Copies of this chain bind each other. A is one copy, B any other.
Amino acid sequence: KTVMYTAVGSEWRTFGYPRRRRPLDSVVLQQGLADRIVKDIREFIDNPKWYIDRGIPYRRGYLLYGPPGCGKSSFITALAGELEHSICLLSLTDSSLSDDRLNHLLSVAPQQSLVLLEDVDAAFGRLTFSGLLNALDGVASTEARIVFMTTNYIDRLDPALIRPGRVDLKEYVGYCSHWQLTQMFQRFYPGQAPSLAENFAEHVLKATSEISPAQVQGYFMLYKNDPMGAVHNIESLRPRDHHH
Q: List residues of chain A with CB under 8 Å of any chain B CB.
A: 4, 6, 15-17, 20, 22-23, 25-27, 43, 47, 50, 52, 54-56, 65-66, 68-69, 73, 76-78, 80, 87, 89, 91, 93-96, 98-100, 103-104, 107-108, 116, 118-119, 122, 125-126, 128-131, 133-134, 137-140, 142, 152, 154-155, 159-160, 163-165, 168, 170, 172, 174, 187-188, 212, 214-215, 217-218, 221, 224-225, 242-244
Asked if residues B242 and A172 are in contact (CB atoms below 8 Å), the reply is yes
* Distance (whole angstroms) from the CB of A55 to the closest CB of chain B: 3
Asked if residues A170 and B56 are in contact (CB atoms below 8 Å), the reply is no
Chain B hits for A22, CB < 8 A: 55
User: Quick one: copies of this chain in the complex?
Assistant: 7
Chain B hits for A87, CB < 8 A: 139-140
Asked if residues A91 and B4 are in contact (CB atoms below 8 Å), the reply is no
Asked if residues B212 and A164 are in contact (CB atoms below 8 Å), the reply is yes
Asked if residues A138 and B73 are in contact (CB atoms below 8 Å), the reply is yes
Complex: A242 Cα to B93 Cα, angstroms:
25
Asked if residues B122 and A73 are in contact (CB atoms below 8 Å), the reply is no
Asked if residues A6 and B103 are in contact (CB atoms below 8 Å), the reply is yes
